[PDB]
UniProtKB/Swiss-Prot annotation, chain A:
Positions spanned in the full protein: 28 to 128 of 128
Protein name per the record: Small ribosomal subunit protein uS14m
GO molecular function: RNA binding; structural constituent of ribosome
Any one of the GO CC terms: nuclear membrane
Keywords: Disease variant, Mitochondrion, Primary mitochondrial disease, Ribonucleoprotein, Ribosomal protein
Species, as recorded: Homo sapiens (Human)
GO biological process: mitochondrial translation; translation
Superkingdom of the source species: Eukaryota
UniProtKB/Swiss-Prot annotation, chain B:
Broad class of the protein's primary localization: mitochondrion
Superkingdom field: Eukaryota
GO biological process terms held by the UniProt record: mitochondrial translation
Protein known as: Small ribosomal subunit protein uS10m
Part of the intact protein present: 52 to 189 of 201
UniProt keyword Disulfide bond, yes or no: no
Swiss-Prot/TrEMBL keywords: Mitochondrion, Ribonucleoprotein, Ribosomal protein
From Swiss-Prot, chain C:
Principal location listed in the UniProt entry: mitochondrion
Keyword Transit peptide attributed: yes
First and last residues shown, out of full length: 67 to 396 of 396
Residue positions where N6-acetyllysine is found in the record: 204
Gene Ontology molecular function: RNA binding; structural constituent of ribosome
Name of the protein described by the UniProt record: Small ribosomal subunit protein uS9m
Species whose genome carries this gene: Homo sapiens
Signal peptide: none
GO CC, one annotated term: mitochondrial inner membrane
Keyword match Ribonucleoprotein: yes
GO biological process: mitochondrial translation
Location in the cell: Mitochondrion
From Swiss-Prot, chain D:
Compartments where located: Mitochondrion
Keyword Ribosomal protein: yes
Keyword field contains Ribonucleoprotein: yes
One cellular-component annotation, GO: mitochondrial inner membrane
Subunit (UniProt): Component of the mitochondrial small ribosomal subunit (mt-SSU). Mature mammalian 55S mitochondrial ribosomes consist of a small (28S) and a large (39S) subunit. The 28S small subunit contains a 12S ribosomal RNA (12S mt-rRNA) and 30 different proteins. The 39S large subunit contains a 16S rRNA (16S mt-rRNA), a copy of mitochondrial valine transfer RNA (mt-tRNA(Val)), which plays an integral structural role, and 52 different proteins.
A GO MF label: RNA binding
Lineage: superkingdom: Eukaryota
GO BP: mitochondrial translation
Name by which UniProt lists this protein: Small ribosomal subunit protein uS3m
Keyword line: Mitochondrion, Ribonucleoprotein, Ribosomal protein, Transit peptide
Family recorded in the similarity comment: Belongs to the universal ribosomal protein uS3 family.
Shown chain mapped onto the complete sequence: 36 to 167 of 167
Encoding gene (name): MRPS24
Length: 101, 138, 313, 132
RNA sequence: GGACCUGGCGGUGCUUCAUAUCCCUCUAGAGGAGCCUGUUCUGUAAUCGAUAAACCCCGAUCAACCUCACCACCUCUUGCUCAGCCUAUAUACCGCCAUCUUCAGCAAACCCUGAUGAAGGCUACAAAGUAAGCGCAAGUACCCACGUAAAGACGUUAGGUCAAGGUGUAGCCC
């Protein structure tokens, strides 16, 4: 019941990234220092690379929550410019008005 | 004629624990509408005077956040629509009030906070030195 | 939306009852409750931040709110009351007839503070719609009436169509002359140039010392043009080396700060010069706040005015 | 030509409300906001969540009171209280309006986990501001 | 075929003007070099749309995977969904816009002129027009009453967008 299959893939990516966040954080900590042996860090490199691809947070895309538009999104409201304007232009967004100065 | 004869008063119990002392309460209200802050200021100030609290008021400078969006659904980059959010402020500064007085006044004015108005109340409490710090062990 | 007399009569009965309700709400005497109190109470009870005041809550008297309506212009028999009804402009032409008639009787017998009413004010005295040429013809007829030897009766009439205009004097205001702990007379003023804001204290007597944020003016303003601006007010009135100045300036750049100080010093210096000298400083451009501030950039163009290159076709 | 939220001139037979008759540039000048909350103030959080909730309540009430709404909803948030103020018509029997108020207040209170109240103002017919 | 009405157009007349604006004039640029970026071509197994003014750092306030809609290979079949489809059609559309507009006109309902033709409707020392409403204007925002924003109708280019979303018609369903 999500807007499209592309929003559904991002929904799954956000769920899997949440499940692997601690594991990835802990493994990365081993890779992000000059204190531990390279032999130990080389193994940590392979371990984090072996995790599921969709656990990687850089693959998460901030899509419009009502239209799934991948660009032109305002992070604060999670809406595309087109959807945001529709609500703003009808006076349904509290405190938001047209700017003249 | 149909008036109550006797009224049950809420039970306020005097404790044996000493009360908190607040040097200052800085109540910063934020809103989009200046007239609503003017009306809230009048209510909050009149409430303080009736309760015997010393209150000062000032208006910090407003904040206007502007941003730009494309006007068309497709192309026509040079045509934009610009929006803004205006945040206006009123700061009620109360001084020399106990913790029991601050609880009643804040509850009274927080419950009556108009829709669309947020409040940031900064409380400055007076404390004595910890007993360990009064003298050096060494 | 026509409004009958019975409708207005009911609206006034509601306003008087509501006027007492509103006074009862605010705990004020209903008898001494004025329209200024009504507006204050309505603004508190119904706070509106709408920029256009006409869109804000209002509780006015029906006479103020509703437009003027002409009454029926004929009776039950259908005969119009006014002999000029069938012109469609009976009030306008009755006025032209009355003014034309007075001009005739005179023959048989023989500025700064006032203006003529505008067409929209005549259109309300008459309660009719007027053309622009109708307005001119009526004014041309009133002017022709002043040039004549109009008497007292012909002067109360012309004054009805004249509206007093409040001219605002351009005379510069003068700051009060204050005294410090040591008893030295001084004046204080302020100035703004772009984003720079200055406050200057000009002493009645001195040697020509100027301190800007505690620094000697030539150390604070190493650019010679900024110093010429400080010289301009005192030089223009022949008072170089006669006053001490201590000023503070914030914001803007070096030139905007010199301009803000120039205006602050000139305004404060007006307390120690003659009225004729103050008018010469005004006419020299030394007492006017420069309104020229940076213009905003607009979207879709390179600058405040510059457009993006019109692409080669 | 601008189109956004502009009821266009016709033959003089189309009744528009005050809300409909004002284009977006009149927002905050001649017309107010239809929802009031703190999410869009400086330094405030959860604006995205308040916006989703508002879009739902408007759709929800449109279909819960079908053919009854005579104007846009006014949404008010104070603390955790949610007040829905609606101008409705006088066609449905009062029993049905009490059923739908009890049903809607309860269902929305459990959905958004907050005390929700619905305030109904009835008018004989849609209030007309002008005929475009 | 004859004569007209309306509109368009005229390397069409007269008159008056343009105000960063047509010429002359003023200042800094582009056109030449390198680089950045878009587009067109060529290439690639390998998207799409915009594309004279009114496309060309344009949809993108943004593509290493993702995004992604493309190509190759492999896999699933009541399938995230009481399915799905970025499949065709913007020359079926809503929505949001470009453009003249750096315009001031549009127009209901009447009335009158032309023998009651298409059509037309003004002269103020006035001669048939009255006109709701819309736009301009006025108000409002920004630092003023200035300026700049905003606003800018009806229409024009079957202008742009079915790939924001929604959707008519047609089509796909191992
Ligand atoms: K022609
Ligand atoms: K060049
Ligand atoms: K170039
Ligand atoms: K369209
Ligand atoms: K579409
Ligand atoms: K379609
Ligand atoms: Mg990304
Ligand atoms: Mg420049
Ligand atoms: Mg535009
Ligand atoms: Mg030019
Ligand atoms: Mg070049
Ligand atoms: Mg291309
Ligand atoms: Mg193409
Ligand atoms: Mg195309
Ligand atoms: Mg891939
Ligand atoms: Mg890719
Ligand atoms: Mg596909
Ligand atoms: Mg088209
Ligand atoms: Mg203006
Ligand atoms: Mg503009
Ligand atoms: Mg305008
Ligand atoms: Mg086309």
């Amino acid at each position: 019941h999500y807007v499209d299959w592309r929003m559904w893939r991002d929904v799954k990516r956000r769920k899997m990234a949440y499940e692997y966040a601690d594991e990835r954080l802990r493994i990365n900590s081993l890779r992000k220092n000059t204190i531990l042996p390279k032999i130990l860090q080389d193994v940590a490199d392979e371990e984090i690379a072996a995790l599921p691809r969709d656990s990687c947070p850089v693959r998460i895309r901030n899509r419009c929550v009502m239209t799934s538009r991948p660009r032109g999104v305002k992070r604060r409201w999670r809406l595309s410019r087109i959807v945001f304007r529709h609500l703003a232009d009808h006076g349904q967004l509290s405190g938001i008005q047209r700017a003249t100065w | 004629v149909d008036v109550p004869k006797d009224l049950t008063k809420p039970v306020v119990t005097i404790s044996d624990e000493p009360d908190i002392l607040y040097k200052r309460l800085s109540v910063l209200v934020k809103g989009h509408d200046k007239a609503v802050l003017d009306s809230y200021e009048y209510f909050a100030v009149l409430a303080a005077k009736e309760l015997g609290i010393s209150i000062k008021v000032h208006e910090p400078p407003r904040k206007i956040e502007r941003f730009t969006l494309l006007q068309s659904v497709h192309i026509y980059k040079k045509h934009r629509v610009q929006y803004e959010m205006r945040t206006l402020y009123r700061c009620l500064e109360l001084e020399h009030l106990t913790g029991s007085t601050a609880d009643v006044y804040l509850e009274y004015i927080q419950r009556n906070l108009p829709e669309g108005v947020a409040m940031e109340v900064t409380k400055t409490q007076l404390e004595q030195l910890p007993e360990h710090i009064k003298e050096p062990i060494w | 939306e026509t409004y009958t007399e019975d409708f207005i009569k009911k609206q006034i009965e509601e306003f008087n009852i509501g006027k007492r309700h509103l006074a009862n709400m605010m705990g004020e005497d209903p008898e001494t409750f004025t329209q200024e109190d009504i507006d204050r109470a309505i603004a508190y009870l119904f706070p509106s931040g709408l920029f256009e005041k006409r869109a804000r809550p209002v509780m006015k008297h029906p006479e103020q709110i509703f437009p003027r309506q002409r009454a029926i212009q004929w009776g039950e028999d259908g005969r119009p009351f006014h002999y000029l009804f069938y012109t469609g402009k009976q009030s306008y032409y009755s006025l032209m007839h009355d003014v034309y008639g007075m001009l005739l009787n005179l023959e048989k017998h023989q500025v700064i503070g006032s203006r003529w009413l505008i067409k929209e004010e005549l259109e309300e005295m008459l309660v009719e719609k007027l053309s622009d040429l109708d307005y001119m013809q009526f004014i041309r007829l009133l002017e022709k009436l002043l040039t004549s030897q109009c008497g007292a009766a012909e002067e109360e009439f012309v004054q009805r169509f004249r509206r007093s205009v409040t001219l605002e004097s351009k005379k510069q205001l003068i700051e009060p002359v204050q005294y410090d702990e040591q008893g030295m007379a001084f004046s204080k003023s302020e100035g703004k140039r772009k984003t720079a804001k200055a406050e200057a204290i000009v002493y009645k007597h001195g040697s020509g010392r100027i301190k800007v944020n505690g620094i000697d003016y030539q150390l604070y303003f190493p650019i010679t043009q900024d110093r010429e601006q400080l010289m301009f007010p005192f030089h223009f009135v022949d008072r170089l080396g006669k006053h001490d100045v201590t000023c503070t300036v914030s914001g803007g750049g070096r030139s905007a700060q010199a301009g803000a100080i120039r205006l602050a010093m000139a305004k404060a210096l007006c307390s120690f010069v003659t009225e004729d000298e103050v008018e010469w400083m005004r006419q020299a451009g030394l007492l006017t706040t420069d309104p020229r501030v940076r213009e905003r950039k607009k979207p879709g163009q390179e600058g405040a005015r510059r457009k993006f290159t019109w692409k080669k076709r | 030509k601008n189109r956004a939220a502009r009821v266009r001139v016709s033959k003089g037979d189309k009744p528009v409300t005050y809300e409909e008759a004002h284009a977006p540039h009149y927002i905050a000048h001649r017309k107010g906001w239809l929802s009031l909350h703190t999410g869009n103030l400086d330094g405030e959080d959860h604006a995205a969540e308040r916006t989703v909730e508002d879009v739902f309540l408007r759709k929800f009430m449109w279909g819960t009171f079908p053919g009854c709404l005579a104007d846009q909803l006014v949404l008010k948030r104070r603390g955790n209280q949610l007040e829905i103020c609606a101008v409705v018509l006088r066609q449905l029997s009062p029993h049905k309006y009490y059923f739908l108020v009890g049903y809607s207040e309860t269902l929305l209170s459990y959905f958004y986990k907050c005390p929700v109240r619905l305030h109904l103002q009835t008018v004989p017919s849609k209030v007309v501001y002008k005929y475009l």
